[PDB]
Ligand binder design. Structure first.
Ligand SMILES: [Mg+2]
Ligand SMILES: [Zn+2]
Lengths: 96, 55, 97, 407, 47, 52, 82, 216, 83
């Protein structure tokens, strides 16, 4: 089993397993379902106005509570100082 | 009281012999019969052959 | 003893093996059903694991030329998320009390 | 005060009371970063003023992001390499077509016509070389294509090699695979494809010699020697390598290959003259190293073995012509003067290319010490006047020298 | 350069203050080694 | 991640790095902040036109 | 600007305290201003949530330097302490 | 070419500040204008709200290229780079991926479909086999209470559901993963644990109130 | 063959071989005394293609000895305390 998609032109040998090809699932008509609603239909409404500017970072829980706002901010600052996914740094000024 | 010099005043130095002998001139050379390298007569190599029989 | 220092170091790094990425982390929906004693127990577990992971990351940063990037870096993020979820649960209970 | 521009990059006189600037030692000019600042960019890591932010994103993208490959992908990358036999067949077909479509040079009267450049041939020959493990000289290829008979020989040999490889496979690949399998867990004769390959490589080397590139000729003969496993072919290749090394002034290798071709005498066919040519090359290498008695002994043994082959006879006559004059001048060649005089133009060209010049490339400009360049002062092999090693002192350990005035 | 030196090609004059500033700087370097300071070049920018 | 995705063929749905569009300026705004509600703005966007 | 842009070896901590520090501290301690402040006794006792959590769920990042105890029998290891 | 440059240069000419620098190089300062422009031109998804909303392109949809190279060609979405607003379509925009040579592996060249821009691609109606305008709609499942978002074509009215995304090829180590039957153990008694906490809080508050009464 | 050795002389004179060797080098290399240092001999971080440079690795003998510094130059409080 090869965990990645084969490149263009490769021929997988027998026995080698390949991740499945993407395909659309089942398909139904619109007149068969009875409750159909458009997403974000109301444009003239006034309740959808942002309470924070569009360039503010989202520091909040999934439910909306701010119990760990400062902890999330500290985690983001620590990740900016040194991310865990940081690969091999190329600059001539390395920490060690 | 000096003023800017035109390109023709600059090239007058080339007409002289002091400019040509310093820049535009070649070397008379030959191949060292021992080292097979280009060589000018009068100067030699650091080599026990080229120091005894200096070609 | 040396057994207390062997837990600061990853065993897979000592055996020159690939450290696998764990399954997940302690979510709030699961931590809500734990008592305070079990919460602080798993908190100290996460603390020891985080100490080991920080030691590994420091070692790789010290030797970044010889050793490449630290393998499986998502463990630090998982530990941080688990500790934050524990703190969330403890804060909720403290506010109720 | 302020007889020019106001920016620090301007070129005229300024003053501090009117145009105060911070200390900027060396910074790039208005056009681009010059080499005087790129030196710092590569050694110190930043420009020598410290005000410039090191922005190496482009070289990071060029090196690290490119050379990064995930392990799970590189585990399977090696499992999809092209088939070596099919690659060799395709490369041989393309190279043969590109050589066949090469136009015939028209011979003009009164002047030498310029040969058509090998533009569409460098890539097919590159694939052929990288698939067969043997490098071909482009000068030799051009000369073989210019020569009408050598071009026909090369075409015939390449066609034979193509047919043999397409009908039976690659015998060198089979040999390497069988050797690797035997090492994991004998030697056959030179096959037809290997014979055609060494034949075309010998043709390429002959064309390269006709051109005048003895180093490349000897290199082609050397990498062709690795494909012959027959005593006759090995003796012929050794004689050819000896001649090429004689022309290239490689006396050691010439002597070695000559004596190898001579040693291949008992197991060779009696019709071959490769052993005679090896004796000739050995004696010629001796004479070039100025061992006249050694060359005479070698050519005498060669004559006694082969009773007077024409090449051996001519070489013996030349050695006798030199011997009829050497005692008339010095009774021998001095020991401290052997292999000292240049005789060939190949070593003259080599000295022109890699000699010590007036001012640079000498022992006074820069010295090499373990793949690093040093000034003339820091020369670990020399403690002449002006070197830093004359200022070491006793290092507070013990009085090493009896010198009173210095050290 | 024999013809040039004969025909005076180049500045017939020369610097005069250097044969004394050189020994002054050497004495200063001695003083710096005494005071345990690193030796610096006399002319870093006046060159 | 660009290189690894190019080599593997997988899909990415969230950014691999958290981007602070304020460059640390949102930490200067107090935590209880929220924009006011503006009535009768000067904009044709709330009409929902789809052909001009 | 009051922000310190120097990240060298002589970086100085700013003794001057601002309003935002107090605001963030209150909001992190007792959810200011959405929650009423706890009484002074709870705020100054060991049962206040910050001190309670710092005691029962300690957060100290003590990591071992491997270059001291890796393939060498040493009597004095080295740790990186907060 | 650094060694060649330094060899062609003369030994008399000296260059200073080789290991140190007059100005402190640890004060943060902005780049050059062209470098900032390079950054802005390369990393455009760093801008706020760069991701297209609503997202309609999911792997498995048949889409045609409407502009650029390979125009009028159909394909199937293989991958989705959602934050860059890019699509990887099948056998479309195939380019050679040069892999550098390592110590034990030679340099290889492989082909791979490169990410294409989302704006220059349009879906294909599965019933009509033609370009259609697709909009996001919300429908409640007949057997599931949740209301999921599907993609309806405005031309024919065909509902196209969104496929899930999950990869279980990687698994955790049993030495550091607690099992689910041990993690989901409900061992929290709210009535017993809240009592001691309330008692401690109340004791502290009463103690401080008594001290205030004392000083008053 | 019996050349002068600093360690042998210090063992003969009972003069603390470390201190004896420090007697023949600048004081700022072995003690906490004001002395200037070249920027090249100070360590530099690692670069792509080269390991890190450490001053302690490139000059192990030119390291300050805190023990000798305290026992020779710094004053002890045990002789000063008077309770
Ligand atoms: Mg300074
Ligand atoms: Zn010579």
């Amino acid at each position: 089993y090869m965990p990645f998609r084969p490149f263009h032109g490769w021929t997988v040998p027998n026995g080698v397993r390949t991740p499945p090809e993407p395909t659309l699932g089942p398909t139904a008509k619109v007149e068969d379902v009875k409750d159909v609603q458009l997403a974000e239909p109301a444009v003239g409404d006034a309740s959808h106005q942002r309470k924070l500017p569009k360039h503010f970072p989202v520091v909040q829980a999934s439910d909306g509570s701010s119990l760990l706002r400062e902890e999330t901010i500290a985690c983001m600052e620590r990740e900016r100082r040194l991310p865990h996914n940081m690969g091999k740094l190329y600059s001539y000024h390395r920490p060690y | 009281p000096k003023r800017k010099k035109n390109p023709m005043q600059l090239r007058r130095k080339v007409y002289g012999l002091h400019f040509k002998e310093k820049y535009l001139k070649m070397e008379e050379w030959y191949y060292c019969p021992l080292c097979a390298e280009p060589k000018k007569p009068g100067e030699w190599c650091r080599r026990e052959d080229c120091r005894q029989i200096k070609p | 003893s040396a057994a207390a220092f062997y837990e600061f170091v990853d065993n897979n790094f000592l055996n020159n093996k690939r450290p696998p990425v764990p399954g997940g982390s302690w979510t709030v929906e699961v931590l809500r059903n734990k008592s305070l004693a079990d919460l602080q127990h798993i908190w100290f577990l996460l603390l020891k694991e985080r100490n080991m992971l920080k030691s590994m990351k420091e070692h790789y940063l010290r030797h970044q030329e010889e050793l490449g990037a630290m393998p499986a870096p998502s463990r630090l993020k998982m530990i941080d998320e688990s500790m934050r979820n524990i703190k969330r649960v403890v804060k909720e209970r403290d506010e109720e009390a | 005060y302020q007889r020019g521009g106001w920016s620090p990059g301007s070129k005229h006189q300024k003053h501090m009371t009117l145009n105060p600037t911070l200390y900027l030692y060396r910074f790039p000019g208005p056009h681009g970063p010059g080499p005087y600042t790129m030196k710092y960019w590569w050694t110190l890591g930043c420009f020598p003023t410290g005000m410039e932010v090191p922005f190496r994103l482009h070289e990071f993208l060029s090196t690290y992001q490119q050379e990064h490959v995930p392990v799970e992908v590189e585990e399977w990358l090696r499992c999809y390499i092209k088939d070596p036999l099919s690659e060799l067949v395709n490369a041989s077909n393309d190279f043969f077509k590109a050589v066949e479509v090469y136009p015939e040079v028209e011979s003009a009267r009164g002047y030498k016509t310029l040969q058509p450049s090998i533009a569409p041939l460098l890539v097919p020959m590159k694939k052929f070389e990288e698939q067969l493990g043997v490098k071909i000289s482009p000068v030799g290829l051009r000369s073989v294509l210019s020569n009408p008979v050598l071009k026909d020989r090369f075409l015939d040999d390449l066609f034979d090699y193509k047919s043999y490889v397409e009908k039976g496979g690659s015998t060198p690949h089979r040999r390497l695979a069988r050797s690797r399998f035997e090492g994991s867990l004998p030697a056959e004769t030179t096959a037809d494809d290997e014979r055609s390959l060494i034949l075309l490589l010998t043709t390429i080397s002959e064309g390269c010699i006709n051109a005048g590139n003895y180093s490349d000729a000897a290199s082609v003969l050397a990498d062709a020697l690795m494909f012959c496993h027959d005593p006759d072919s090995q003796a012929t290749t050794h004689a050819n390598i000896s001649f090429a090394s004689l022309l290239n002034a490689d006396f050691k290798g010439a002597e070695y290959n000559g004596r190898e071709a001579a040693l291949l005498q008992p197991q060779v066919k009696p019709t071959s003259t490769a052993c005679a040519r090896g004796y000739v090359g050995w004696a010629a290498a001796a004479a070039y190293q100025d061992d006249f008695e050694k060359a005479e002994a070698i050519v005498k043994d060669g004559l006694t073995l082969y009773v007077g082959n024409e090449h051996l006879e001519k070489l013996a006559n030349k050695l006798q012509a030199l011997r009829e004059e050497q005692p008339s001048v010095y009774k021998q060649v001095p020991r401290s003067l052997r292999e000292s005089r240049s005789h060939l133009p190949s070593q003259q060209s080599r000295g022109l290319l890699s000699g010590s010049g007036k001012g640079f490339s000498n022992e006074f400009d820069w010295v090499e010490f373990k793949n690093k360049l040093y000034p003339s002062k820091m020369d670990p092999r020399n403690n002449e006047m002006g070197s830093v090693f004359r200022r070491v002192g006793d290092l507070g350990s013990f009085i090493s020298t009896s010198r009173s005035m210095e050290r | 350069s024999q013809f040039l030196k004969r025909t005076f090609v180049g500045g017939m004059g020369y610097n005069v203050k250097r044969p004394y500033r050189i020994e002054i700087r050497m004495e200063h370097d001695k003083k710096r080694r005494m005071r345990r300071r690193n030796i610096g070049c006399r002319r870093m920018m006046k060159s | 991640v660009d290189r690894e995705v190019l080599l593997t063929g997988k899909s990415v749905w969230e950014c691999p790095i958290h981007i602070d569009h304020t460059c640390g300026g949102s930490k200067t705004v107090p935590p209880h902040a929220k924009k006011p509600v503006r009535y009768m703005d000067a904009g044709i966007a709330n009409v929902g036109v789809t052909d001009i | 600007p009051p922000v310190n842009d120097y990240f060298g070896r002589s970086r100085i901590w700013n003794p001057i305290a601002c309003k935002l520090g107090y605001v963030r501290k209150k909001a992190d301690e007792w959810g200011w201003p959405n929650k009423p402040p706890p009484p002074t006794g709870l705020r100054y006792s060991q049962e206040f949530f910050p001190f309670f959590f710092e005691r029962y769920f300690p957060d100290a990042e003590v990591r071992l330097l491997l270059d001291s105890v890796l393939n060498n029998e040493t009597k004095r290891p080295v740790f990186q302490i907060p | 070419r650094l060694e060649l440059l330094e060899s062609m240069r003369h030994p008399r000419e000296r260059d200073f500040y080789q290991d140190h620098t007059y100005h402190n190089q640890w004060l943060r300062r902005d780049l050059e204008k062209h470098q900032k422009q390079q950054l802005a031109a390369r990393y455009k998804y760093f801008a706020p709200d760069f991701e297209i909303s609503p997202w309609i392109w999911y792997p498995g949809d048949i889409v045609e290229v409407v502009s650029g190279e390979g125009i009028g060609q159909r394909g199937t979405i293989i991958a989705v780079i959602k934050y860059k607003n890019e699509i990887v379509v099948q056998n479309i925009n195939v380019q050679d991926v040069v892999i550098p040579a390592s110590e034990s592996r030679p340099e290889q060249i492989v082909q791979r479909e490169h990410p294409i821009s989302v704006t220059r691609v349009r879906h294909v109606d599965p019933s009509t086999n033609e370009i259609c305008n697709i909009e996001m709609v919300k429908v409640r499942n007949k057997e599931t209470g949740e209301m999921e978002e599907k993609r309806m074509s405005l031309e024919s009215g065909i509902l196209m559901s969104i496929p899930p995304v999950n990869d279980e090829l990687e698994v955790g180590d049993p030495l550091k993963d607690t099992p689910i039957q041990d993690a989901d153990e409900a061992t929290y008694d709210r009535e017993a644990e809240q009592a001691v906490l309330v008692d401690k809080r109340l004791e502290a508050m009463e103690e401080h109130f008594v001290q205030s009464l004392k000083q008053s | 063959r019996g050349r002068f050795n600093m360690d042998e002389a210090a063992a003969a004179l009972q003069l603390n071989p470390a201190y004896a060797a420090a007697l023949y080098r600048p004081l700022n290399y072995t003690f906490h005394i004001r002395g200037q240092l070249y920027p090249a001999q100070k360590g530099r971080p690692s670069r792509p293609g080269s390991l890190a440079a450490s001053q302690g690795r490139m000059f192990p003998l030119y390291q300050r000895n805190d023990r000798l510094d305290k026992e020779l130059f710094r004053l002890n409080s045990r002789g000063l305390t008077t309770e």
